[PDB]
Design a protein that fits this description.
The complex is a heterohexamer, with two copies of chain A and four copies of chain B.
Chain A (H helix, E strand, L loop, with lengths): L2 E7 L3 H10 L1 E4 L2 E5 L2 H13 L5 E7 L6 E6 L4 E4 L4 E6 L1
Antiparallel strand pairs in A: 1-3, 1-4, 2-3, 4-5, 6-7
Chain B lengths: L20 E6 L3 E5 L2 E5 L3 E4 L5 E6 L4 E3 H9 L3 E6 L2 E6 L9 H11 L1 H15 L10 H23 L18 H23 L16 H25 L6 H16 L1 H12 L14 E3 L5 E3 L6
Parallel strand pairs in B: 1-5, 2-6, 5-7
Antiparallel strand pairs in B: 2-3, 3-4, 7-8, 9-10
Helix pairs in contact in B: 2-3, 3-6, 4-6, 5-6, 5-7, 6-7
Classes of the chains: A alpha+beta (92), B alpha/beta (309).
Chain F binds four DNA strands through helix 4, helix 5, helix 6 and helix 7.
DNA sequence: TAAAGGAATCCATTACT
DNA sequence: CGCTCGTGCGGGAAAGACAGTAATGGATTCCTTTAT
DNA sequence: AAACGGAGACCTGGTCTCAATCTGCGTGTTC
DNA sequence: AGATTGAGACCAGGTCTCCGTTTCATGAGTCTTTCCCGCACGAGCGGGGGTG
């Protein structure tokens, strides 16, 4: 099973604890977990519905030559595609 | 689907029965629910447990659990086993992970029929001892022979690892001891019983509808655990008892080696497959449109939720 | 052969020497371990390892439930670790003749004014649907609540009529109690006679016995007595938990479960829905201490 | 290649920018990459020698039941092995 | 080992030449080293490039790159190619990623010997077209056959994808990039040239010591690139030109398709192994 | 046969029509690119895409260096994108006859008096080592700085004698400028004659020519006057930087590289450095416009 | 005169580099 | 026909050569006080 | 002209704590 | 009694601006040979349909 990382900032406490129920909290708001595509999509839906007015960002093992891809919900750091390569873009 | 709520999860949102971790031992700590999270508070801090990724949870001596913690653990399919001293003390589980009962119906059909029960016990004995033939002996002969071979394996491994065995055998019902060998066997078997209980509960099978063991609610748990106690838990506990030095936690090393054995032997996928093949369930990848249905004599299943005016 | 369905909530259970203790805000209770048959652990309950070990040693069945059993959350083992109820249920559901017998028995106890022993499954279910419609109309006209047709979405609870929401909440609060009783007695919720193919099939089969007598009147009473914008599901659950406080429904459920499985009257255990501080004078002669 | 995650908190800006040559920064102080074992070990050694008085934690694919393991260097949250299984432990103030 | 300095890294601390990404195109931006990180700044914001995981870092029009930025890019073995309009305009590279010059001295030995040069030219032509036999062809004959085959492939792919084509064989030195087919070919070809340059500079080989192409500093780059050009880039560019829409960025689509081709064909590992067997190691 | 070596630092190069526009704080310079041979982009320099376009069009050899070439960071193409020097170096290093001839020429220009026609390659190495010891002792007695053996720890620069640190820093600065000149000219640093098997073998093979006469005296001087508590690497780098500011060392290196490869004197190109704000008087006739 | 002895002279052997 | 564990080939690093000197003991030589 | 480190400035987001309110997550004879 | 939520509080760390100090972290007077580690290679089971 691939690897998934979810970073949550300014989200309800319930979402943080619920993710700790699925994936462990390495850092404040930073979770890592091992599971397949189906569970990953279900967890992303959970985060999307129960994040409220906060930002979420999930980095998951994928099929690009970097080896990972990004899905961000209302996140400060956008994801910009340089010709097939996801790069984290920080607006000024 | 419906709205997503913290603390409640669908069966699909959780890993399958065989894809989870095996077990966790917790002692001298309090399990509670905070922020919709199962947290074990020790004397120094908190540990958030990925309950969705853990098949069964073991509770040692001096351990507290809260009502909300129990229902939260039951949400994710994690089973509670109070593994105190002298073996497993109590079990607990929530609703079954599997909404369908295609396994439980077949288990009931086999356990009720005497011929099918004999066939299933024979298949269990074949899986434990594949060399022999079991086409002739009866139930009492099966019990006597399995007990004889169990104590034969106990004596063999005790001689091999040079540990003193007082002509005993491990049975979770009233097994007490203080020797390192007894503690190692208890620690190695409580994990197996907890894992078996979790796998049976998560499959919808009845823990009470046993074939070889009868007379209690955890007979089928014992029967399914017997298929692997001889192969896995006994040699591992013997090796732990032999290897351990003075002033070493025999339980901790026993559980470490037990988890190593579970990962190496692929006991979880093997256990799911064994449970599927004992009940003669053909492989069927198609998923039913609706689990619940009303029962009819001539039309067999008839859809539910409709008013017959 | 009596089972004490002791209900614990807002408490922290531990063990003193050989008897569990209760640490409710009212005081301290020291129930002997052998006294408890089934311990219904309600919300705000902290059960300890020593207490669980002692209760398991005596065959006590621990069921983590909601307030007065409205929701079933988790269950331990059976009462006294017995399995005769489960084996009898399996025997009666496996073969068709016993399945017809028990389905007819359930329909007959659901039809007190008629004898339905000759009807087949199609006629039985048609009669059940007609009775459901008649009861819906009767309780609609009694409470002056409009009623057109039972419509709901399992995936959308909010987007429903208040009547349907109240009925769903009350029926689920009944399913919780039925599942709690089934798990405490040791039966298997999956092996149902009329309903089949689900984890909670036998629970629905047993709960249909009390649907028309408890949950439907409660749902219609809540729907009638409700202002616009109020959370009607909470009201229905609270009214249903108020219905379960007395414990008569619990004893009725235990007796009905015995009757369905053709248990001989000598083998019929009787539930004793005890309350801690409501029955102090009843429990002091039995060895229970009530400290404050 | 196994996925490696490094979280940095209160470290000199030199390291914070330097890791971005290997691992992208999804959020403040969080870096994700895909390396082999040797490159990841050298990255952890570099983080150890550069972070100074700071907090660093790495998670990488392993061969246990969960499938990941942690190396924490002067981090608030420790790692405790529950009989061979890594669980993050949070000391209480 | 010794102390680690932010912005300085050993070669063992880096991914191999095979394990890194292909390239990144940057245009109308400013590469700049801030906090010891190569950051491309645009109007909206900034993006920090993972230099250690990228082979070549192409630079588009309107691109200003600092001094410490080039120092840091050369540290991680990332080569720079100033990809402007109508072809590659300039190259740049750090020192090297390999501390052993065995491959370089072997290449020099093979290029200074006329018989060895002819042998390597025959091997490269056979590697381009394995169905033919050229054991008796001279150098001029080999060059003429290469030209004929590449023009034939160009015309064949022109008819295959049903697109106008002027038979203009791509020469990066002052190319004619007016047409959408020309733009797509240039967009793929500059990426291939940048990748070849990055690999050659990372393996220690001399870009000037060429076998078929000679007379300038990037001859061996052109040889190695021409080895895969007709087989990778040309079909991709012709598909992009054929599969196109009005108002669609032809360059971005071409670069996406050529990166997909590079990943699918494993042209990076293939390039390294081809250099291995082409130099007798 | 003319090659301009312009060192641009603390500046920002752009392009207007056909001439690069250096934007130093002193003023704006408008050097035509047709006469630029080598552009040493020193620290604090910002090059633009139009500038690189124009320079690569004219065959300019951009080299990103440190202060006056103390460190070599990156390089572009060569003069006029020519590879004749590289071809000659390869043809001279592949065969042992020419390689030995070039090594002998190296030794004889390092030591004009000693005969080389009888010394083999390892004989050359041994003699070079002996003369290096002699030079080290002579400069040690001239500058007081005592001289225990050269103990260069590659991984730990802090641990060592101040004189050892001075030698290391001066030598790496010399390697940097030698590499800058070699990369600008177009030769490969790998193809070394005396030194072999490393990336910069030719760089050491050109730096040993000037080590004893430039960097060793500099290192001994800086160690002699080194006060306690001062880092020696920076001082040695700065002193070598100044020696390179003088500008004749680059001319000598280009001349010696042309001598090693027996390049005919008719076809040899002569390199001269150009400082913008120090040599503007010669630049004005060339068309280099200035603005203050 | 010459033994004689050690210090100094010149030489030989090896470790330093 | 896609998965693992045991078999190894491109990197290393480490000694180990290759050349001659510096210092000290031995052989030689000179003095220099020993004894006379 | 760049890039850094140090020293301030400042801000947002995480976390602890105090009342206050509830005990909770709702199909299964509806189509 | 246990858990959640809102409010209100505090505060550690992040980000920015400003400022002065840098252009930097510094081997190869010599190397080949013999050692190694590599992270590739490796092969079988698969699981087929076929077998029964």
């Amino acid at each position: 099973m691939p690897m998934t990382v979810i970073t949550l900032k300014n989200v309800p406490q319930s979402l943080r604890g619920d993710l700790t129920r699925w994936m462990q909290e390495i850092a404040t708001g930073v979770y890592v977990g091992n599971f397949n595509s189906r569970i990953r999509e279900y967890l992303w839906r959970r985060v999307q519905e129960t994040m409220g007015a906060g930002e979420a960002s999930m980095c998951f093992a994928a099929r690009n030559e970097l080896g990972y891809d990004f899905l961000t919900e209302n996140a400060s750091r956008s994801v910009i595609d340089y010709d097939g390569l996801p790069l984290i873009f920080i607006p000024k | 689907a419906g709205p997503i709520i913290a603390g409640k999860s669908e069966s699909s949102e959780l890993p399958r029965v065989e894809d989870r971790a095996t077990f966790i031992y917790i002692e001298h700590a309090k399990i509670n629910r905070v922020d919709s999270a199962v947290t074990v508070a020790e004397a120094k801090g908190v540990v958030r447990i990925p309950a969705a990724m853990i098949g069964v949870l073991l509770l040692g001596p001096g351990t507290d659990i809260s009502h909300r913690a129990v229902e939260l653990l039951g949400d994710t399919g994690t089973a509670l086993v109070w593994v105190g001293e002298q073996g497993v003390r109590y079990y607990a589980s929530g609703r079954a992970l599997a909404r369908s009962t295609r396994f439980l119906v077949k288990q009931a059909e086999l356990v009720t029929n005497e011929r099918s029960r004999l066939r299933v016990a024979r298949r269990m004995y074949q899986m434990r001892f594949p060399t022999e033939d079991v086409s002739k002996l009866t139930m009492q002969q099966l019990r006597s022979h399995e007990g004889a071979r169990v104590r034969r394996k106990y004596r063999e491994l005790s001689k091999k690892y040079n540990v003193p065995w007082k002509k005993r055998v491990y049975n979770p019902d009233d097994f007490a001891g203080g020797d390192p060998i007894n503690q190692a066997l208890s620690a190695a078997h409580v994990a197996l019983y907890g894992l078996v209980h979790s796998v049976v509960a998560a499959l919808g099978l009845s823990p009470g509808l046993g074939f070889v063991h009868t007379g209690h609610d955890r007979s089928f748990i014992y029967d399914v655990a017997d298929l692997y106690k001889a192969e896995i838990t006994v040699p591992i506990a013997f090796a732990v008892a032999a290897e351990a030095e003075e002033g070493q936690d025999i339980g901790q090393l026993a559980r470490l080696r037990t988890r190593d054995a579970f990962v190496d032997g692929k006991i979880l996928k093997r256990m799911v497959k064994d449970l599927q093949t004992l009940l003669e369930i053909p492989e069927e990848g198609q998923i039913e449109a609706e689990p619940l249905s009303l029962w009819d004599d001539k039309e067999k299943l008839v859809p539910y939720g409709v008013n017959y005016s």
